[PDB]
C-alpha cells in the first residue's frame, strides 16, 4: 500500500460503498461555529469540478436573530472538509445539507449548545456531523457537558445519529490540547457522550489501483510546536459505560471511545477546496464526515428508519468481524506512552472502519 491524499469522491470505493444507494433520500446536518459563506462557494467548486449535480443547502441561525454569524476564516477549512467529505462519502448526493450555525456572540459555550439544540428540536436531519470538541473535564467544570448531554440524549431517543470526531491530540486532550504528558490520558467532549457515535482516526493505505489496502492508527507525531497529532481514544472519566459496550471485556465502567474510525492522517488525507485552493487535510475532523456520508447512504437504503446505532454496532461487529477493517498496528500517544491498537476493539480506533456493503447486507438480513 501507498500513503497519499484522496479526492473525497474516492471514499465510497475505499470503504466498499459503491454498490449502496447514495444519500439522496437522507437529510444531513453539520454543526458549525459562525457562518459558511465561503464554504458554500467551495462546495459549488467541489460539486462542479467533480461533475456532480449541485447540493441543496440551507443555513440556520441557531441563536439570537441579532447574533454573529459572520464567517470564521479558519472555521471555513473545517466546514469545507466536513461538507465535501460528507457529499463525496455519500456517493455525490444528499437530500439536503443543513448548516446549524452557532452564534459567535453568545456567552460561554451557549452558542454551540443552542446549535445542537436546534438540530435536535427541528428533527429534520437524520445524521449530524460534529467535527469539534475539547477536554471533557473543562466541559464538565462549567456545566456544558451536562447541558449538551441532555440534547444528545433527546437526539438518540428520536433516532438521530450525531457523529463526533474523537480528537486530534491522541491521549493528551486535556494537556493544553495535545502536549505530551507521560502517562496522563484524557478524552474529548462531546465524543465521550454515550448518546453520540465517536469516530477516531486511521492512516489509510491504498493499492496502486485505488483500492483499500490497510489502515493503521493515525499518529503523525509532534508538530513544530511540540503538539501531538493523533487519534483521540480512551474512556470518559465521567460518563458510565452504556451496556452495549460490555462486550469489550477488561475495560472500566466508563464510556469507551471511539466507536469506529476512518481516515484521519494528513499524509493520507482528503483533497479539499478551501477559499478556492485545493489542500490536503486530515484530522478526526475528516473521519467523522466520512462516517456521516456513508451512514447516510445506509439510511437512504433503509427508508431513514435506522435508529441510533451504537448498541447495534457493538453487537453486530463483536459477533461479525467481517463488517470492519480491524486496525491492529500503532498507538495514540508519544514516547512509549498511550494506548496500542490490537485485535478487535481498541482505544485508538474502536472497532476500526466499516465495510459498508457488508454492513448493508447484514442490515438487510438482520435489521439494525
Answer yes or no: is 282 a known binding residue: no
Nearest residue (CB) to Ca ion, 307 versus 344: 344
Rounded Cα distance between 28 and 129, Å, is 8
Nearest residue (CB) to Ca ion, 168 versus 326: 326
Rounded to a whole number of angstroms, the distance between the first and last alpha carbons of the chain is 33
Restricting to residues 320-339, name those near Ca ion by CB under 5 A: 326-327
Determine how β-strand 324-325 pairs with β-strand 353-354: antiparallel
142 counts as catalytic: no
Catalytic residue among 16, 78, 148, 168: 78
Helices 284-301/356-366 angle, 10° precision: 40
Helix ranges (H only) for 131-209 are 136-141, 144-157
Residue 337 cell numbers, joined = 506512552
By the rule CB under 5 A, 259 interacts with Ca ion: no
Rounded to a whole number of angstroms, the minimum distance from the CB of residue 65 to Ca ion is 47
Radius of gyration of the chain from its Cα atoms, rounded to whole angstroms: 18
Rounded to a whole number of angstroms, the minimum distance from the CB of residue 138 to Ca ion is 29
78 counts as catalytic: yes
* One residue of 63, 346, 354, 355 binding Ca ion per CB under 5 A: 346
Rounded to a whole number of angstroms, the minimum distance from the CB of residue 339 to Ca ion is 11
The residue whose Cβ lies closest to Ca ion is 346
Using an 8 Å Cβ cutoff, are 110 and 67 in contact? no
Q: Angle at Cα 232 formed by Cα 246 and Cα 193, nearest 5°?
A: 50
Measured CA to CA in angstroms, residue 319 lies from 16, 115, 135, 271 at distances of 20, 37, 33, 35
Rounded to a whole number of angstroms, the minimum distance from the CB of residue 323 to Ca ion is 13
Answer yes or no: is 324 a known binding residue: no
Using an 8 Å Cβ cutoff, are 203 and 283 in contact? no
Measured CA to CA in angstroms, residue 63 lies from 33, 34, 196 at distances of 11, 10, 22
Rounded to a whole number of angstroms, the minimum distance from the CB of residue 368 to Ca ion is 22
Rounded Cα distance between 103 and 306, Å, is 31
Nearest residue (CB) to Ca ion, 304 versus 315: 315
Nearest residue (CB) to Ca ion, 31 versus 204: 204
Nearest residue (CB) to Ca ion, 167 versus 233: 233
Answer yes or no: is 327 a known binding residue: yes
Answer yes or no: is 247 a known binding residue: no
Rounded Cα distance between 254 and 20, Å, is 35
Catalytic residue among 131, 186, 193, 285: 285
Nearest residue (CB) to Ca ion, 72 versus 346: 346
288 counts as catalytic: no
Size of the site for Ca ion (CB under 5 A): 3
Stretch that binds Ca ion, among 6-14, 147-155, 264-272, 319-327 (CB under 5 A): 319-327
Residue 145 cell numbers, joined = 457537558
Catalytic residue among 82, 181, 239, 355: 82
Residue pointed to by grid coordinates 455519500: 90
Determine how β-strand 254-257 pairs with β-strand 260-263: unpaired
Stretch that binds Ca ion, among 194-202, 253-261, 283-291, 341-349 (CB under 5 A): 341-349
Answer yes or no: is 326 a known binding residue: yes
**Active-site residues: which are they?**
78, 82, 285
Residues that bind Ca ion (CB under 5 A): 326-327, 346
Amino acid at each position: 500500500g501507498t500513503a497519499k491524499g484522496h479526492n473525497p469522491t474516492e471514499f465510497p470505493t475505499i470503504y466498499d460503498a459503491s454498490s449502496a444507494p447514495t444519500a439522496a433520500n437522507t437529510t444531513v446536518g453539520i454543526i458549525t461555529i459562525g457562518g459558511v459563506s465561503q464554504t458554500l462557494q467551495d462546495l459549488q467548486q467541489f460539486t462542479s469540478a467533480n461533475g456532480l449535480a449541485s447540493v441543496n443547502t440551507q443555513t440556520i441561525q441557531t441563536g439570537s436573530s441579532n447574533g454573529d454569524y459572520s464567517d470564521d476564516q479558519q472555521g471555513q477549512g473545517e466546514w469545507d472538509l466536513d461538507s465535501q467529505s460528507i457529499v463525496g462519502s455519500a456517493g455525490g448526493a444528499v437530500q439536503q445539507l443543513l448548516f446549524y450555525m452557532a452564534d459567535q456572540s453568545a456567552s460561554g459555550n451557549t452558542g454551540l449548545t443552542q446549535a445542537f439544540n436546534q438540530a435536535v428540536s427541528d428533527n429534520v436531519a437524520k445524521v449530524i456531523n460534529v467535527s469539534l470538541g475539547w477536554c471533557e473535564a473543562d466541559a464538565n467544570a462549567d456545566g456544558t457537558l451536562q447541558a449538551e448531554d441532555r440534547i444528545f440524549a433527546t437526539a438518540a431517543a428520536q433516532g438521530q445519529t450525531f457523529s463526533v470526531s474523537s480528537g486530534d491530540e491522541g491521549v493528551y486532550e486535556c494537556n493544553n490540547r495535545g502536549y505530551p504528558d507521560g502517562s496522563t490520558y484524557s478524552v474529548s467532549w462531546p465524543a465521550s457522550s454515550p448518546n453520540v457515535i465517536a469516530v477516531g482516526g486511521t492512516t489509510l493505505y491504498t493499492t496502486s489501483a485505488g483500492a483499500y489496502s490497510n489502515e493503521t492508527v493515525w499518529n503523525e507525531g509532534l508538530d513544530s510546536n511540540g503538539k501531538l497529532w493523533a487519534t483521540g481514544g480512551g474512556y470518559s472519566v465521567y460518563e458510565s459505560k452504556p451496556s452495549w459496550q460490555s462486550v469489550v471485556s477488561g475495560t472500566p465502567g466508563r464510556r469507551l471511545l471511539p466507536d469506529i474510525s476512518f481516515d484521519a492522517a494528513q499524509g493520507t488525507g482528503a483533497l479539499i477546496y478551501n477559499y478556492g485552493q485545493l489542500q490536503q487535510i486530515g484530522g478526526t475532523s475528516l473521519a467523522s464526515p466520512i462516517f456521516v456520508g456513508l451512514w447516510a447512504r445506509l439510511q437512504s437504503a433503509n427508508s431513514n428508519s435506522l435508529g441510533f446505532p451504537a448498541a447495534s454496532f457493538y453487537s453486530a461487529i463483536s459477533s461479525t468481524p467481517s463488517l470492519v477493517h480491524d486496525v491492529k498496528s500503532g498507538n495514540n500517544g508519544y514516547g512509549g506512552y498511550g494506548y496500542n491498537a490490537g485485535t478487535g476493539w481498541d482505544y485508538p480506533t474502536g472497532w476500526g472502519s466499516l465495510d459498508i456493503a457488508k454492513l448493508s447486507a447484514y442490515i438487510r438480513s438482520n435489521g439494525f
